[PDB]
Amino acid sequence: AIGGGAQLLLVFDRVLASSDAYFSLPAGIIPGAANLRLGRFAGPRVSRQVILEGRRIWAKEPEARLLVDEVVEPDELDAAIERSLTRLDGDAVLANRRMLNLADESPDGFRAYMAEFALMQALRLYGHDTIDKVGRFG
Amino acid sequence: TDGLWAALTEAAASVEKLLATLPEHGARSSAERAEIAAAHDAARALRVRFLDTHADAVYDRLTDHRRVHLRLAELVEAAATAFPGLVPTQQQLAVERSLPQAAKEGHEIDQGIFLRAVLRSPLAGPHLLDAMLRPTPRALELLPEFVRTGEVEMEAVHLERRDGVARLTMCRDDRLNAEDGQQVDDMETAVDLALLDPGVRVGLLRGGVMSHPRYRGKRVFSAGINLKYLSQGGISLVDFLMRRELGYIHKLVRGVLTNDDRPGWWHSPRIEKPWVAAVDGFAIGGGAQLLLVFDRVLASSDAYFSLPGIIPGAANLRLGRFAGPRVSRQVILEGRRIWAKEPEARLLVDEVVEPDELDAAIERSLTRLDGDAVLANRRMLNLADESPDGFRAYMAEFALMQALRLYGHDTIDKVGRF
Amino acid sequence: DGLWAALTEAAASVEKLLATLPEHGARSSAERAEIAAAHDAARALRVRFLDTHADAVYDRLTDHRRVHLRLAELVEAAATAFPGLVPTQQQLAVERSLPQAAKEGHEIDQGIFLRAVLRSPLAGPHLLDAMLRPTPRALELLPEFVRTGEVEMEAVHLERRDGVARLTMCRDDRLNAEDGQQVDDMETAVDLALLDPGVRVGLLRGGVMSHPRYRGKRVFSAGINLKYLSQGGISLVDFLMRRELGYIHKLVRGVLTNDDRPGWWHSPRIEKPWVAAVDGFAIGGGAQLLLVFDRVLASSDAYFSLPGIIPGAANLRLGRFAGPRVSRQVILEGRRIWAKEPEARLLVDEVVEPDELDAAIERSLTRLDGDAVLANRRMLNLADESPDGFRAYMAEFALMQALRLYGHDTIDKVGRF
Amino acid sequence: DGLWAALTEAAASVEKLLATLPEHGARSSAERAEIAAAHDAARALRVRFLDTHADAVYDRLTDHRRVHLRLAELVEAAATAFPGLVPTQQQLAVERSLPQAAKEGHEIDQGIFLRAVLRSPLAGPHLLDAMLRPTPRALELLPEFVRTGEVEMEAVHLERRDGVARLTMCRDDRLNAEDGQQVDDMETAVDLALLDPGVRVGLLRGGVMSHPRYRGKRVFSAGINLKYLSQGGISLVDFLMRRELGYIHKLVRGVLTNDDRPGWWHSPRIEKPWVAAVDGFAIGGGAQLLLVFDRVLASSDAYFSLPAAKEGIIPGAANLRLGRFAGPRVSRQVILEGRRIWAKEPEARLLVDEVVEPDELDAAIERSLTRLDGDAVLANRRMLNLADESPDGFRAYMAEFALMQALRLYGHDTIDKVGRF
Numbered sequence A: 001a002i003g004g005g006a007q008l009l010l011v012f013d014r015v016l017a018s019s020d021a022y023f024s025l026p027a028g029i030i031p032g033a034a035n036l037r038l039g040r041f042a043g044p045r046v047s048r049q050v051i052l053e054g055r056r057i058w059a060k061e062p063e064a065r066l067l068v069d070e071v072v073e074p075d076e077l078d079a080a081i082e083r084s085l086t087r088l089d090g091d092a093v094l095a096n097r098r099m100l101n102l103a104d105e106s107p108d109g110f111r112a113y114m115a116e117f118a119l120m121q122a123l124r125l126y127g128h129d130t131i132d133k134v135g136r137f138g
Numbered sequence B: 001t002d003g004l005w006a007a008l009t010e011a012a013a014s015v016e017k018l019l020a021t022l023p024e025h026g027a028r029s030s031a032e033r034a035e036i037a038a039a040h041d042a043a044r045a046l047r048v049r050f051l052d053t054h055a056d057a058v059y060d061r062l063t064d065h066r067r068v069h070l071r072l073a074e075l076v077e078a079a080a081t082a083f084p085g086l087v088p089t090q091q092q093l094a095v096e097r098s099l100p101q102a103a104k105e106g107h108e109i110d111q112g113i114f115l116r117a118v119l120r121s122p123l124a125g126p127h128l129l130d131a132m133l134r135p136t137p138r139a140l141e142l143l144p145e146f147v148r149t150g151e152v153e154m155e156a157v158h159l160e161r162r163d164g165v166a167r168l169t170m171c172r173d174d175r176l177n178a179e180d181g182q183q184v185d186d187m188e189t190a191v192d193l194a195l196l197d198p199g200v201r202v203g204l205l206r207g208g209v210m211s212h213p214r215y216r217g218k219r220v221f222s223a224g225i226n227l228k229y230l231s232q233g234g235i236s237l238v239d240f241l242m243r244r245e246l247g248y249i250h251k252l253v254r255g256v257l258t259n260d261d262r263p264g265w266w267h268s269p270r271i272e273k274p275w276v277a278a279v280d281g282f283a284i285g286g287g288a289q290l291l292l293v294f295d296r297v298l299a300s301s302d303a304y305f306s307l308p309g310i311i312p313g314a315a316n317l318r319l320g321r322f323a324g325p326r327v328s329r330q331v332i333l334e335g336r337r338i339w340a341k342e343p344e345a346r347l348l349v350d351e352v353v354e355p356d357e358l359d360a361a362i363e364r365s366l367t368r369l370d371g372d373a374v375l376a377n378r379r380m381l382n383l384a385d386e387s388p389d390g391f392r393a394y395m396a397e398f399a400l401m402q403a404l405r406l407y408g409h410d411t412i413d414k415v416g417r418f
Numbered sequence C: 001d002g003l004w005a006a007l008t009e010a011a012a013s014v015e016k017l018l019a020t021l022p023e024h025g026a027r028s029s030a031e032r033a034e035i036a037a038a039h040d041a042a043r044a045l046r047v048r049f050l051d052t053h054a055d056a057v058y059d060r061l062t063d064h065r066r067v068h069l070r071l072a073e074l075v076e077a078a079a080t081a082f083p084g085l086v087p088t089q090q091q092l093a094v095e096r097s098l099p100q101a102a103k104e105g106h107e108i109d110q111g112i113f114l115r116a117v118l119r120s121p122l123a124g125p126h127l128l129d130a131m132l133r134p135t136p137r138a139l140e141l142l143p144e145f146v147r148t149g150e151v152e153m154e155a156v157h158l159e160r161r162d163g164v165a166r167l168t169m170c171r172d173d174r175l176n177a178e179d180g181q182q183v184d185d186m187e188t189a190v191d192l193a194l195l196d197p198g199v200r201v202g203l204l205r206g207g208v209m210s211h212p213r214y215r216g217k218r219v220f221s222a223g224i225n226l227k228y229l230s231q232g233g234i235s236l237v238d239f240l241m242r243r244e245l246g247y248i249h250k251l252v253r254g255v256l257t258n259d260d261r262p263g264w265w266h267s268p269r270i271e272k273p274w275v276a277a278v279d280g281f282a283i284g285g286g287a288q289l290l291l292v293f294d295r296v297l298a299s300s301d302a303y304f305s306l307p308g309i310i311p312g313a314a315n316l317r318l319g320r321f322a323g324p325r326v327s328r329q330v331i332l333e334g335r336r337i338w339a340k341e342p343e344a345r346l347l348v349d350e351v352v353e354p355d356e357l358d359a360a361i362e363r364s365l366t367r368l369d370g371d372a373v374l375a376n377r378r379m380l381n382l383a384d385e386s387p388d389g390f391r392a393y394m395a396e397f398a399l400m401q402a403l404r405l406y407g408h409d410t411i412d413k414v415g416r417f
Numbered sequence D: 001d002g003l004w005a006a007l008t009e010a011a012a013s014v015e016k017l018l019a020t021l022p023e024h025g026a027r028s029s030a031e032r033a034e035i036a037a038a039h040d041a042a043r044a045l046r047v048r049f050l051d052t053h054a055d056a057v058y059d060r061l062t063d064h065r066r067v068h069l070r071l072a073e074l075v076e077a078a079a080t081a082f083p084g085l086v087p088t089q090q091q092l093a094v095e096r097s098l099p100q101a102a103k104e105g106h107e108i109d110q111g112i113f114l115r116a117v118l119r120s121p122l123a124g125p126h127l128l129d130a131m132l133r134p135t136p137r138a139l140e141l142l143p144e145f146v147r148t149g150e151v152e153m154e155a156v157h158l159e160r161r162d163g164v165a166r167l168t169m170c171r172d173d174r175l176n177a178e179d180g181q182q183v184d185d186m187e188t189a190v191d192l193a194l195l196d197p198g199v200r201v202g203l204l205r206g207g208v209m210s211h212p213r214y215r216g217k218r219v220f221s222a223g224i225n226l227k228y229l230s231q232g233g234i235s236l237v238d239f240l241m242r243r244e245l246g247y248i249h250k251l252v253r254g255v256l257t258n259d260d261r262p263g264w265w266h267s268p269r270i271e272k273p274w275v276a277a278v279d280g281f282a283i284g285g286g287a288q289l290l291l292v293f294d295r296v297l298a299s300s301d302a303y304f305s306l307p308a309a310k311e312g313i314i315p316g317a318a319n320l321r322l323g324r325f326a327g328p329r330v331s332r333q334v335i336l337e338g339r340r341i342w343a344k345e346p347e348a349r350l351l352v353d354e355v356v357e358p359d360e361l362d363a364a365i366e367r368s369l370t371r372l373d374g375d376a377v378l379a380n381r382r383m384l385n386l387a388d389e390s391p392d393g394f395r396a397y398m399a400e401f402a403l404m405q406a407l408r409l410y411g412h413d414t415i416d417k418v419g420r421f
């Protein structure tokens, strides 16, 4: 899961990953709302390692546990995915995830971030730094 | 003498009698399959009993009372000619070798019985293991040209001297370096050239770039024994399963036994050097076994190690000392797979490096093992880890245990499914 | 030579003093010192006699290694063929009637004997073969087990099911505390598991307990019966030595059969893979057993400890699982290891919540079916633990444990449970 | 046979060349190669002679293994009974008169001898017993120590207190760098600890240092005295070998006493449990010792390394013992590549039982000394060591060690590196 794909993992209730997967946020522009959310998953050191210095995290290393709930061999993954889908049905699950998200990330928190994000990201989109690098892909 | 040679010959006579008159392996009835199976068992049981008391006498005949060093191939062929019915001749192995594993009679098991009994003998055992540590004729042949060019290209291994480093590159681009009898010949020869070349100080083992569409442009260390050849009957008990353990793998641990043609030979009859391994892709099976004998192991972040119905060579001997009894049973008995980035990879791996940082990390490792002190220390280390008695006792039982597994019905089924 | 005469003189002095002196606990310090000095002179000569005469002694008892005698038969036969070398069945019966505090320690003489036998490269391996042979009780009960797939004994319930030898240790009143009978049942069950061709894997687990503190809960083992040990009911030979040379060694190496089946030329012993499931805790000898299985499972709330006598062969095996530092922590300093802490993986393969344990156990029993597993576990065990290694240890164990069984500090602490 | 004559002729050739040739540093390349070839031809015959005659030689020196001779006594007696087999006391005195660079390496001949002796299943175990017997020095000092509870030696201060033999390595000026005297003081102290009936546990710790960079701070050990090694003052026999077969092995197996007390039939040796406390760091031979204790404590800031090997020589028996503590990978990292291990990193839990802050260290040491009193501990540690490290295992290793280390002691690269400290 790279870039915007990795960003999505910061918002789910359960994350599973195959033993041979990796996660990265590789530069140029801002990685969506990862700057808002990664710190709460991984702390201030690791999130700068991932975002500012492009550190890559492998599913099987200990700190992958900061982003991923289960790491499973490819053969054993499909069945484990099914088992995880049975464990979240309650109305209690809805009430508890509603309170969890509320505490993790407040309306003000998200709004304040996205406000600055709208301009900061727009500027990054037209910086000489990004335009050249992305134009060397391949 | 004590009657056992007569009983053996009488038991071998019945087996050849039954094989001559009975139908083919695939056309036999249950009664016929039980008659021949019983004939085999009675004969092999006497091969064990004969050799339990007469092993040293047999070996002394073949080796002139342990004064001539015979390699494995030469030994089992000489025993066949000196002791008919004790081990297959050659004309018999050729018939066996034409058949698929399913249809074989299992004559190699008789070789397992022979090699087990020899290796158990405190006099013959150490003599045979020295024989297998001496330089191969192929390497002695190729040494002057290698000293001059610093390059030898073989079918399964490309060897290159550069900066005092023997660079062995396993280059079976089409099969992820799947092992066969030829690969063992190239590996043993390549190791010999590295050890005897005075301009070589450290060795390096690494898998080359692959051509198969699924791994094109990517290095792969090893995918283990060639399962296709095993199913087709092309994997030799002596010339592959045993040869690699007593030859090049053991020369990595102890070195090559030279004559007495240089100063020092009184204290170091063997020339040994340190070895570095770098795992790209994955190390499966026999490739993973090799890692248990190196002085430094490096592997890329995305690689994995596994040992997947036969014995994984000397991994049963060595893995527990790296990983303890629990994990070594987990890996061997239950096929656990270990990833380069997980904590317990450090039981097998010194360094794990991102692919973009791997080539340079390998280079730095080759500079750090140059001393004569390194040679003394790895020698004292290996001596402590794995004793001559220890290794010899294991390989003895292995020769028979692996021989039977090579012909187990569940093995023949599993390997034949591709 | 002269040593047998000097020995007979020293034993005569001991039996003379024991006849004339008062009972243990009514002796004076002067009297206690006289008898202790006589014991010391006698046992020192038992050592000196056997250092040179062990092989001749064993050869007389075994027809130059022509007859496989188990331990009990060996020490008894030794007593009648060599009076004063080891205690008689009578002398042992008097000892057994006493509490450990008051015993003379005649068993130490058996410790001396078994040490010298096991030290012999000729007699040692022969006795270890004898103890690997199937027990007569199992040969007796095998047909009925083949036909009923069930045998209920005092301390162990055995059931064949789905090709699995299910051993369930079911002393519900005492947390599976071990005694001589448990060893008789454990060895018998292991034999049946190995000789039954309808059995492919074994399983050892503790049964549901009835004691009020654990009612409805399974518990693996709480170690040796300390009450019996204090009361004098723990036999050096028939418990401490029998279990190490019998069922525990058969878990590693299998049963040594007669040459009465094909294969015997390459496989004289029938061995199978073994799975252990630890509920509650594994203490003492129960924790010791875990060092010998091919798969070990434990519930999240369990712990392992070795708590003053030698913990069987734990001193032999723990170092290979955990290294020299942790093994001294566990053995010398009584460290207790919990299933959920990292270093439990040195002893345990899976740690599972109790609600998921039953199914997790079942899955493991399907994963050890191959003949490949049988070939692999044999080569693994051979590399882990050599014949010389085991024999060298158990020889010394025979004396060291014999002495620890009768030390003043041991007798004191065992009487305070 | 003929091998003794061939040896005596080869040694004669060497003595001739040494007499007629210029000194070491004034020799030509042709002269350097001629003498080297003579040494090799002679030493090769010392190996071949002893391969068949080791048992007979040892039998003459020890009266068929009924007299226990220590190393120094053995290698001298061998010199006089078998001229040319091993150097004389006079030849050795000249050797130590030179710096290591200029030596002929006659000690290599002692390595050849001791290897062959230890390889013998009969002579080997006998020599290892001799070295486990009490030293005369300790037997000498045992009465006053029993009375006083105190012995001050040059390199070690010994004190009995609360049933604890407190050994304090007290080379305040050099971070407890080891030399031949230190080995003598260590073995003497260890002997006294074992024979003293008032001692129940042992304790080894480094004393307060006076050197300006470490004034007021304890330091465990900084390894072999590299200065002395360069100057030629480190003996193969009296240091590198004496320490392994003497006091370090006595920590494992105890002192072999006479048949002079009850129990001597089940317990021929007196052994006790030992505790080590590492302040500052444990380097080289100091770190080697840790592989042999029953409890090891260290302050949070200390580190462990074995920087022999890459540098010059084999790190004692660490090659024998480290793998069982840390496995083949980590043990090669430490030995082959000079990896350093810090007390607070996870893997210090391969060598060390407790790592505690400097302000809490003394109290932890005291508490640990209270936990190893039993006769049960003694039987248990005895069964453990028996399993961890067999008599054959140790003997096989030290035999090869005797020759391998001797050659490293005179290696071209070692002499260079040791002279730069």
Ligand SMILES: CC(C)(COP(=O)(O)OP(=O)(O)OC[C@H]1O[C@@H](n2cnc3c(N)ncnc32)[C@H](O)[C@@H]1OP(=O)(O)O)[C@@H](O)C(=O)NCCC(=O)NCCNC(=O)Cc1cc(O)cc(O)c1
Binding pocket: A002, A003, A004, A005, A026, A029, A030, A031, A032, A033, A121
């Ligand atoms: C994973 C890889 C290392 C593997 O590549 P290789 O194994 O060398 O294979 P390739 O041949 O490149 O892969 C096959 C295929 O994938 C295609 N591919 C891979 N990545 C891309 C991207 N990013 N765009 C388009 N196509 C792609 C590539 O075009 C190939 O097709 P061909 O043209 O037929 O060759 C590689 O794909 C790679 O490095 N890709 C670049 C990854 C990258 O940087 N992606 C963008 C990350 N940045 C963000 O998400 C930023 C972001 C996202 C947001 O949603 C919001 C926001 O605010 C900021």
Ligand SMILES: CC(C)(COP(=O)(O)OP(=O)(O)OC[C@H]1O[C@@H](n2cnc3c(N)ncnc32)[C@H](O)[C@@H]1OP(=O)(O)O)[C@@H](O)C(=O)NCCC(=O)NCCNC(=O)Cc1cc(O)cc(O)c1
Binding pocket: B174, B175, B176, B178, B179, B212, B214, B223, B224, B225, B226, B227, B228, B241, B244, B284, B285, B286, B287, B308, B310, B311, B312, B313, B314
């Ligand atoms: C590597 C894999 C996991 C992934 O491969 P995929 O990416 O799924 O691609 P595949 O197409 O399977 O493999 C790519 C390519 O290599 C070929 N390949 C890879 N490994 C092999 C082997 N082992 N044999 C033959 N061909 C092979 C495979 O056939 C493909 O080529 P084509 O068939 O010609 O198209 C898979 O190939 C696989 O499962 N391989 C088998 C691995 C294995 O179990 N090997 C043997 C392990 N056992 C030993 O080493 C036993 C041993 C060896 C010894 O030397 C001594 C001893 O005592 C015991």
Ligand SMILES: CC(C)(COP(=O)(O)OP(=O)(O)OC[C@H]1O[C@@H](n2cnc3c(N)ncnc32)[C@H](O)[C@@H]1OP(=O)(O)O)[C@@H](O)C(=O)NCCC(=O)NCCNC(=O)Cc1cc(O)cc(O)c1
Binding pocket: C173, C174, C175, C177, C178, C211, C213, C222, C223, C224, C225, C226, C227, C228, C240, C283, C284, C285, C286, C307, C309, C310, C311, C312, C313
């Ligand atoms: C199990 C415990 C931790 C649980 O705590 P509680 O639940 O509070 O305890 P208890 O009430 O005592 O346990 C419940 C119940 O089991 C009984 N129980 C448990 N273990 C025993 C033993 N070993 N003997 C007798 N009774 C026992 C206990 O007596 C209670 O029953 P009541 O007498 O009816 O009250 C505790 O009971 C305890 O510490 N037990 C002692 C454990 C122990 O020291 N075991 C053995 C230690 N040493 C060896 O095995 C040594 C050994 C064994 C060998 O096989 C070989 C060898 O060479 C060396």
Ligand SMILES: CC(C)(COP(=O)(O)OP(=O)(O)OC[C@H]1O[C@@H](n2cnc3c(N)ncnc32)[C@H](O)[C@@H]1OP(=O)(O)O)[C@@H](O)C(=O)NCCC(=O)NCCNC(=O)Cc1cc(O)cc(O)c1
Binding pocket: D173, D174, D175, D177, D178, D211, D213, D222, D223, D224, D225, D226, D227, D240, D243, D283, D284, D285, D286, D306, D307, D308, D313, D314, D315, D316, D317, D405
């Ligand atoms: C630990 C250190 C970094 C300390 O750093 P600093 O605080 O900068 O220290 P220094 O100021 O140098 O230390 C003070 C002082 O102690 C003395 N000192 C320190 N270490 C040593 C050593 N190793 N030898 C001798 N003297 C020493 C030296 O005299 C120093 O300076 P001066 O007195 O002014 O000359 C440093 O001392 C160091 O690196 N020392 C070298 C240690 C080393 O490599 N030792 C070799 C270890 N290897 C063996 O023992 C091998 C061995 C031993 C055996 O017993 C058996 C065997 O088979 C093999």
